[PDB]
Each structure stands twice: as C-alpha cells, then as structure tokens.
A paper describes a structure:
PER2-CBD adopts a highly extended structure, devoid of a hydrophobic core. In the crystal, PER2-CBD meanders along one side of CRY2-PHR and sinuously wraps around the region. With nearly half of the PER2 residues involved in binding, the two proteins bury a total 2800 Å2 of solvent accessible surface area at the interface, which stretches over a distance of more than 215 Å. In comparison to its FBXL3-, KL001-, and FAD-complexed forms, CRY2 adopts the same global fold when bound to PER2-CBD. The largest structural variations take place in two local regions, the interface loop next to the FAD-binding pocket and a serine-rich loop neighboring a secondary pocket (see below). The PER2-CBD α3 helix preceding this loop packs against the long CRY2 C-terminal helix at an approximately 30° angle, while the region C-terminal to the loop locks onto the same CRY2 helix from the other side. Together, these PER2-CBD structural elements encircle the CRY2 C-terminal helix like an U-shaped clamp. Superposition analysis reveals that FBXL3 and PER2 cannot be simultaneously engaged with CRY2 without clashing into each other. In the complex structure, these two cysteine (C1210 and C1213) residues face a pair of cysteine and histidine residues in CRY2 (C432 and H491), which are also invariant among vertebrate CRY1/2 proteins. Together, these four residues sequester a strong density at the center, hinting at the coordination of a Zn2+ ion at the end of the PER2–CRY2 interface.
Residue numbers in the entry:
A (entry chain A): 21 to 510
B (entry chain B): 1131 to 1195, 1201 to 1214
The structure:
C-alpha cells in the first residue's frame, strides 16, 4: 500500500480523518499541495491571503519534518499532475478532505472519474464541517434549510459532530522514510511570495500568522479567562474590538489550520466547567453554526455567489458605477468610518463582522446601490476568512437579498462609527491624513469649520476625498427604492 | 521579475486623483429613478425566487408575514 494525501483546505496534521486513512494500511506515503504559482494569483492586491496560505504550507512542512518527511508542493493542475504522480509513485490510493462547495465538488468528481479509470482507491472525510452536510439536507426533504432558525432545528435532531480524530503518528509513520531525494526543495519546495509575483520589500510581520501551529496556540489563548469573559460573557463593542485579536480564529477555521470540531468540543468543555452545565445553549456555538449553515445553504448551489441564477437570491436593479465601486474598494469614499475599515481590511486581511456590516451596507442597500456580488469579489481577494459559501451567504443577508434572518436598519457611515469608537482612535490609526482632527469633527471632516481643515494639514478634496455622496440625501431615496422592490414583491 | 495587475474593479474604473480625491455621485429625482426599477423588475420578477408550501411557511417564523426593518424615512442617524 502506497498512497497520497492531498491538501487544499484542512491544512492541519490534527483532526485529519483523511490523512489518518492514508497511513493505516500504508507502507510509505507522501502529502501534497498543488499550485501553479505562475497563474495562481489574480491580482496585486491579494498579498495577505497568499502570504497566509504560504505560511500555512511552510508550517505543514515543518510539522512533517518532525515526521522525517516533508510537504510536497507540486507545480501544476489537478488534472495534469495527478496521472503522472500516479505512475511515478504507483500510488494505491488517494485521500483528501471533502469539499462541499459546488465547483470543488465537480472538479473533485472529474478527478474521481480519473482515479477510478486508473484503478486507484479514494476516501473522503468531511472534516471541514461539523456535520455531514448532505444529511442535514436529506433530513429536510433533500433541500437546503432556508432560514437559520430551521437550520438550528435540523441539527439538534441529528447526531453530535464527530470527535476530533487523534490525527498524527510517529513510530507508526515517522519511519516511512523510504525515498529521500535531496533535489527536493528545488522541485517540491514551498513557493515564496515572489514566485507568486508579489514584491516583499518593506514587508512587516503578518498580523495573521498562518499555520496549524499558530492556530492551536490561538485556540488556547482563546479559551482563557480574560478572552472568554470578553468574548463569550460580557461582549461589548469598543474601539479595541475592531483591532485584530490575538485570539481571533476565523482565518484558521477557513484554511483548516484549526479543526472546527476541535474548536467545538473545547468550547463545550470550557462551558461545562465554568457554568457547571453539560448542555450549553446553541448560541454558544453560533460562530461555527453560521459557518455550517452557509456551507450547507450553498453546497448544491453552483450560483450561490451570484444574484441571477440563484434560486434564493432576490433579484434587484443594482446600479453600475465602476468609479464608485473603486472608491469603496480602495478606501476613498470620503467617509472616514468606511474608508478606515476598508484600509484595515487591505493592510491586515480581517475586519470585525460589524465593520463588515457597515461596509457592506454602504455599498449595497445604504448609499451606492452597487451589487453585493461585487462586494463578494472585493472580499474574496482581501478577506482572510472569506470563501465561496461564507462570503456570499453573508453578503446576501446584509444587502437584504436573502432570507436567512431578520433584516435590520442601515448602519450609518458617520453615526455608527462615533457610537462604536467615539475617540476616533481607530480612524486616526488607519487614516493618518486625519490625525490632527478633533474626534468631534473627525467622522465628518466636510461639515467641520474651515479653520480646522486649514490647521490640520489636510484639506477636504485635496489631501482626503470629498464625500462620495451625502448620506441623508441619497439614503432618503434608496430606502424608497428598497420599499418598492418589497411592495412590488410576491 | 513578475508584475501582477490591479484587480478587475480598478482596471474597469478611472482611478486618477480627481476621481479618487473628489468624484461625487449625481443628485437625482425620486420618481424618475423609481419608475425605472419597476420596469427592470418586471423583467427580473421571473426568477424572483419562488418557494412552495414547505418552504413558504418558514419565512413567517423569521419574518413579519417584512417592511419591518425598512418601513422608515431615512436610515436612522441623519434624517
Ligand atoms: Zn444616517
């Protein structure tokens, strides 16, 4: 038995029911990530996600070193390399973690058609999600739950998520060092950002360090008294919450550097101990259940991330305005609360979900009437924890285009900031052209006494953008357009 | 040496300083831009999402049988 475990997500040694599978009958096996660095990356603006991916593989390599093995990044396409890799290695079987998302599925299947017709065995474990998503779907008449309320109900009636596998092996794997070619780094080394086409001069330490190793350490911090209280007990919105938490876990969950299940049965264990209750409210797991919901709402929906062709998305006459979408994307809307969320997003690769809500509102329903599926595009390159299902699902709800949950008033581009962080500490941080402005004026630098803009080294329209629109003006009109879509809706 | 390019949203847009630093959105009329939506909607209201009895019921549990979060004059902070 000689096999291959293929990494795409599930970038982790722990809770890997797929990497476990491959090793049990095996004589000698090898792991792979497959990348064509030459065409992999879509744009100059997407450095954070690729840096995160590459630190992740690098960690995987380090971890696999301690197993006297290494990670094999293979340049090419999962279509051209697989057959060759079959012949050169005589691999008896292939193991990889189930990808639910529509396009992955298709691709995964056509790569199953290939392995079967080449007489190689295949096992998929679904360890990216808590549940077998298909069963949630069959339990509901083989259709996906349309509301979060019904989603919740359906999973309370099913088994509990599988326990984290005891994935990792030493004396039963570490000595599977059959073949050792030292031409290795030259051919299967982990790419650098430059092979991807990114310039890495002047480049600081990643705010969000990749890898399973950073993920597991983060889990532990996440679950200590101070982080617990502040996140799970007395949650309050402060200027500090906007900041990238050292305990944040969303990116690690997305790449699979952390197991969503391990996270699950530890968030439970901590509740059990601290509250002396062995059956916790469902809302405790809220951040995971919403991730599940979406992975579920989209698995049989090839067009989940598009308005038209999507069976659950309201169709709406969004405007085209490429200059507007650009000013938004760049953080040059002229509205400091928005522009600083967009700036943070771009430098760091993460924003707080309410910063997301505010920014999603400004572009869609609130002020510019640009299609949400464009916001999804912008975040797909920028946001560490975005992916097909999670990112589009979220944007549908926020724009008022889907029925996952109760709608809610439009956050204000000027008000909702000064409530959230009155100090203006956040804005001064990400927009240093606006340091010498008093918090009083700062969220609205246009309606602030001219003397100040003169005596603040930045004048509006010259060093900082004049306001894309004015809020009340344009928001007075979209709300009626919004009612119209709903009046005339049956 | 490799040079990736700007993402599509930039390439499709005029992003020189006058657009970035001071482009403004237009000032319009309500009943003009309102009517156009009606026509496009008549096109659109084909997919429109349609559900069935099994699905149509769950919305009542989460939604007011809907203008609730929108039946207002502006948003909620500058009107
Ligand atoms: Zn407002």
């Amino acid at each position: 038995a000689s096999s291959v475990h293929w990494f795409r997500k599930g970038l982790r040694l722990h809770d890997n029911p797929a990497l476990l599978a491959a090793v049990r009958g095996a004589r000698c096996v090898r792991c792979v990530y497959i990348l064509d660095p030459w065409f992999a990356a879509s744009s100059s603006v997407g450095i954070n996600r690729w840096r995160f991916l590459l630190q992740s593989l690098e960690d995987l390599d380090t971890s696999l070193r301690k197993l006297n093995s290494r990670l094999f990044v293979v340049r090419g396409q999962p279509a051209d390399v697989f057959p060759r890799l079959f012949k050169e290695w005589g691999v008896t079987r292939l193991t990889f973690e189930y990808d639910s998302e529509p396009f992955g599925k298709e691709r995964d299947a056509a790569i199953m058609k290939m392995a079967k017709e080449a007489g190689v065995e295949v096992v998929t474990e679904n360890s990216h999600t808590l549940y077998d998503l298909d069963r949630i779907i069959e339990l509901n008449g083989q259709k996906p739950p349309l509301t979060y309320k019904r989603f919740q109900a359906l999973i309370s009636r099913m088994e509990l998520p599988k326990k984290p596998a005891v994935a990792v092996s030493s004396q039963q794997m570490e000595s599977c060092r059959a073949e050792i070619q030292e031409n290795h780094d030259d051919t299967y080394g982990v790419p650098s950002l430059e092979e991807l086409g990114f310039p890495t001069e002047g480049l600081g330490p990643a705010v969000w360090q990749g890898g399973e190793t950073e993920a597991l350490a983060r889990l532990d911090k996440h679950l200590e008294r101070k982080a617990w209280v502040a996140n799970y007990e007395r949650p309050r919105m402060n200027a500090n919450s906007l900041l990238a938490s050292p305990t944040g876990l969303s990116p690690y969950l997305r790449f699979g550097c952390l197991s969503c299940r391990l996270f699950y049965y530890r968030l439970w264990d901590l509740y059990k101990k601290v509250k002396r209750n062995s059956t916790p409210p469902l809302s405790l797991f809220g951040q995971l259940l919403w991730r599940e919901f979406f992975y579920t709402a989209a698995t049989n929906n090839p067009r989940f991330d598009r308005m038209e062709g999507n069976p659950i998305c309201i169709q709406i006459p969004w405007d085209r305005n490429p200059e507007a979408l650009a000013k938004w994307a760049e953080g040059k809307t002229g509205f400091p609360w928005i522009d600083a969320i967009m700036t943070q997003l771009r430098q760091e690769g993460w924003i707080h979900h309410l910063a997301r809500h505010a920014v999603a509102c400004f572009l869609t329903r609130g002020d510019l009437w640009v299609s949400w599926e464009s916001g999804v595009r912008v975040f797909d390159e920028l946001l560490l924890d975005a992916d097909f299902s999670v990112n589009a699902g979220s944007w549908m709800w926020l724009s008022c285009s889907a029925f996952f949950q109760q709608f809610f008033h439009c956050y204000c581009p000027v008000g909702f900031g000064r409530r959230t962080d009155p100090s203006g500490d956040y804005i001064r941080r990400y927009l240093p052209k606006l340091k010498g402005f008093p918090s009083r004026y700062i969220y609205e630098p246009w309606n602030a006494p001219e003397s100040v803009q003169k005596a603040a080294k930045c004048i509006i329209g010259v060093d900082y953008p004049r306001p894309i629109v004015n809020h009340a003006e344009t928001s007075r009109l979209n709300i009626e357009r919004m009612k119209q879509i709903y009046q005339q809706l049956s | 040496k490799y040079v990736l390019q700007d993402p599509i949203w930039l390439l499709m847009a005029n992003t020189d300083d006058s657009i970035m630093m001071t482009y403004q959105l237009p000032s319009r009329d309500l009943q003009a831009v309102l009517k156009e939506d009606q026509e496009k909607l008549k096109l659109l209201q084909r997919s429109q999402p349609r559900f069935t009895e099994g699905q149509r019921r769950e919305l009542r549990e989460v939604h007011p049988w809907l203008p609730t979060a929108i039946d207002v004059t502006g948003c909620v902070y500058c009107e």
